[PDB]
Write an enzyme that holds these catalytic residues in place. Structure first.
Site, PDB file in Angstrom:
ATOM      1  N   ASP A 139     -36.051  32.197 -20.851  1.00  0.00           N
ATOM      2  CA  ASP A 139     -35.608  32.240 -19.574  1.00  0.00           C
ATOM      3  C   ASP A 139     -36.520  31.888 -18.394  1.00  0.00           C
ATOM      4  O   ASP A 139     -37.093  32.624 -17.668  1.00  0.00           O
ATOM      5  CB  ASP A 139     -34.822  33.385 -19.244  1.00  0.00           C
ATOM      6  CG  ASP A 139     -34.033  33.175 -17.874  1.00  0.00           C
ATOM      7  OD1 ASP A 139     -33.962  31.992 -17.213  1.00  0.00           O
ATOM      8  OD2 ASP A 139     -33.427  34.356 -17.500  1.00  0.00           O
ATOM      9  N   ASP A 178     -33.594  26.393 -14.243  1.00  0.00           N
ATOM     10  CA  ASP A 178     -33.437  27.767 -14.654  1.00  0.00           C
ATOM     11  C   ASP A 178     -32.626  27.530 -16.251  1.00  0.00           C
ATOM     12  O   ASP A 178     -31.711  27.139 -16.339  1.00  0.00           O
ATOM     13  CB  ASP A 178     -32.300  28.291 -13.874  1.00  0.00           C
ATOM     14  CG  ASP A 178     -31.823  29.823 -14.441  1.00  0.00           C
ATOM     15  OD1 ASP A 178     -32.476  30.513 -15.075  1.00  0.00           O
ATOM     16  OD2 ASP A 178     -30.761  30.382 -13.751  1.00  0.00           O
TER      17      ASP A 178
HETATM   18  C1  LIG Z   1     -25.403  34.033  -9.829  1.00  0.00           C
HETATM   19  C2  LIG Z   1     -26.238  34.589  -8.843  1.00  0.00           C
HETATM   20  C3  LIG Z   1     -26.019  35.359  -7.723  1.00  0.00           C
HETATM   21  C4  LIG Z   1     -26.753  35.949  -6.707  1.00  0.00           C
HETATM   22  C5  LIG Z   1     -28.034  35.973  -7.414  1.00  0.00           C
HETATM   23  N1  LIG Z   1     -28.334  35.588  -8.228  1.00  0.00           N
HETATM   24  C6  LIG Z   1     -27.510  34.855  -9.213  1.00  0.00           C
HETATM   25  C7  LIG Z   1     -28.282  34.506 -10.401  1.00  0.00           C
HETATM   26  C8  LIG Z   1     -28.507  33.283 -10.489  1.00  0.00           C
HETATM   27  C9  LIG Z   1     -29.219  32.516 -11.395  1.00  0.00           C
HETATM   28  C10 LIG Z   1     -29.663  33.473 -12.450  1.00  0.00           C
HETATM   29  N2  LIG Z   1     -30.348  32.701 -13.575  1.00  0.00           N
HETATM   30  C11 LIG Z   1     -31.110  33.680 -14.626  1.00  0.00           C
HETATM   31  N3  LIG Z   1     -31.839  33.184 -15.608  1.00  0.00           N
HETATM   32  C12 LIG Z   1     -30.865  35.126 -14.490  1.00  0.00           C
HETATM   33  C13 LIG Z   1     -31.422  36.006 -15.567  1.00  0.00           C
HETATM   34  C14 LIG Z   1     -30.611  35.839 -16.943  1.00  0.00           C
HETATM   35  C15 LIG Z   1     -31.143  36.734 -17.875  1.00  0.00           C
HETATM   36  C16 LIG Z   1     -29.093  36.065 -16.349  1.00  0.00           C
HETATM   37  O1  LIG Z   1     -28.893  37.147 -16.343  1.00  0.00           O
HETATM   38  N4  LIG Z   1     -28.450  34.762 -16.565  1.00  0.00           N
HETATM   39  C17 LIG Z   1     -26.817  34.799 -16.406  1.00  0.00           C
HETATM   40  C18 LIG Z   1     -26.879  33.984 -14.959  1.00  0.00           C
HETATM   41  C19 LIG Z   1     -25.359  33.638 -14.523  1.00  0.00           C
HETATM   42  C20 LIG Z   1     -24.539  33.115 -15.612  1.00  0.00           C
HETATM   43  C21 LIG Z   1     -25.389  32.886 -13.463  1.00  0.00           C
HETATM   44  C22 LIG Z   1     -24.732  34.948 -14.053  1.00  0.00           C
HETATM   45  C23 LIG Z   1     -30.435  35.687 -13.265  1.00  0.00           C
HETATM   46  C24 LIG Z   1     -29.570  34.767 -12.302  1.00  0.00           C
HETATM   47  C25 LIG Z   1     -28.981  35.213 -11.543  1.00  0.00           C
END
Ligand SMILES: Cc1cccnc1-c1ccc2nc(N)c(C[C@@H](C)C(=O)NCCC(C)(C)C)cc2c1
Length: 370
Positions: free
Chosen positions: A220, A34
């Site tokens: 991403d 990721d």
């Molecule tokens: C942290 C979490 C809890 C429940 C469900 N999903 C997540 C999660 C984990 C990894 C992720 N990784 C990603 N690249 C994304 C999309 C991206 C644009 C984003 O919002 N990144 C911030 C991710 C974060 C810092 C873990 C909140 C969303 C994500 C969401």
């Protein structure tokens, strides 16, 4: 880097993962790759969705940091307990490093029922690490503790099983054709880039380029879709709608509400337009463009789903973009390279492309500031 080719697996829409080991003796886990987060976090409890989980009681090299971490998301959360342990990547470099690990002890809508991964490897920078930027990300630890060069590259090849390569510490020139073209990493938090022009079938959307990067644009591997700021999405859909009007589809399809089907092997690829993003180049007033096909943005679920969607967090160049290209995350030089992927899906008439140089003025104005 032959040892690393084909080291990624996944299921369509469930992400790409790499095999890792944690602890002594080593515990094998599958870990999502990721580039849109910065935590290394693994299941550490018997959630019923999980094939396996990190058992800290079995590891002689585990060290507790006596600190919790809580990571909410728009839908869901994960929460856990911070520690360090020895980590390796079997089909990666021949090194072992002491890395921060969040042992996930409670979660909601994080793990996927039916998936084959048990944790996540955040490859972005410390600025977006939780709980804060003092928690050194995995790749930072890898580079600091070993002689692995400060770069990695991803070839994502697009439930059907998916595959790809993560080349840690280098570039494998067999994975792409033509030349790499580089765009600057605007700031080291996400892998933030600047989009300076957008075309649908060669036709400029003609928006103020600040709209394209409102409030950021990122690369991403953790996102399936090409996500676009709302204003840009509606302009983009309007144009894609028009370009493919020789066949008509329900309004809901463009919003991802429903599929569209054809008989086996008769998908009308040619009626759908290409999508080009011009990225800021290395030199003043110089850009290049990357171009994807409907084969990238129409994703199988022969039925397909429209994989371009609106966003309030900016442009997100997810798998829809990445599956066209070999992408080099050149951290050492604060730049991201794109080249035509040797594995991308195309047809006899069109292929994904990376082309330059183009003349683009006022590119610095395209970036968003507070
Ligand atoms: C942290 C979490 C809890 C429940 C469900 N999903 C997540 C999660 C984990 C990894 C992720 N990784 C990603 N690249 C994304 C999309 C991206 C644009 C984003 O919002 N990144 C911030 C991710 C974060 C810092 C873990 C909140 C969303 C994500 C969401």
């Amino acid at each position: 880097f032959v040892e690393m080719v084909d080291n990624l697996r996944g299921k369509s829409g469930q992400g790409y993962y790499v095999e890792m080991t944690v602890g002594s003796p080593p515990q094998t886990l599958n870990i999502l790759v990721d580039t849109g987060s910065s935590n290394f976090a693994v299941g550490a409890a018997p959630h019923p969705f999980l094939h396996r989980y990190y058992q800290r009681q079995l590891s002689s090299t585990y060290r507790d940091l006596r600190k919790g971490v809580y990571v909410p998301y728009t839908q869901g959360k994960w929460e856990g307990e911070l520690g360090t342990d020895l980590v390796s990547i079997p089909h990666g470099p021949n090194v072992t490093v002491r890395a921060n690990i969040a042992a996930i002890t409670e979660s909601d809508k994080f793990f996927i029922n039916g998936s084959n991964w048990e944790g996540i490897l955040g490859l972005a920078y410390a600025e977006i690490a939780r709980p804060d930027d003092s928690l050194e990300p995995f790749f930072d630890s890898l580079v600091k503790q070993t002689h692995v060069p400060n770069l990695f590259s991803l070839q994502l090849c697009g439930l059907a099983s998916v595959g790809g390569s993560m080349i840690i510490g280098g570039i494998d020139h067999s994975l792409y054709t033509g030349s790499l073209w580089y765009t600057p990493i605007r700031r080291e938090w996400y892998y933030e880039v600047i989009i300076v022009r957008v075309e649908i079938n060669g036709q400029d959307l003609k928006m103020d380029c600040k709209e394209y990067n409102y409030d950021k644009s990122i690369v991403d591997s953790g996102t399936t879709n090409l996500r676009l700021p709302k204003k840009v999405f509606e302009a983009a859909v309007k144009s894609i709608k028009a370009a493919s009007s020789t066949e008509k589809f329900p309004d809901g399809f463009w919003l991802g509400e429903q599929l569209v089907c054809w008989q086996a092997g008769t998908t009308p690829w040619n009626i759908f337009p290409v999508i080009s993003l011009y990225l800021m180049g290395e030199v003043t007033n110089q850009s290049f463009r990357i171009t994807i096909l409907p084969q990238q943005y129409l994703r199988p679920v022969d039925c397909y789903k429209f994989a371009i969607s609106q966003s309030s967090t900016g442009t997100v160049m997810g798998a829809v973009i990445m599956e066209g290209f070999y992408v080099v995350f050149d951290r050492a030089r604060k730049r991201i390279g794109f080249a035509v992927s040797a594995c991308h899906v195309h047809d006899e008439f069109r292929t994904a492309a990376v082309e330059g140089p183009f003349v683009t003025l006022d590119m610095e104005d395209c970036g968003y500031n507070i």
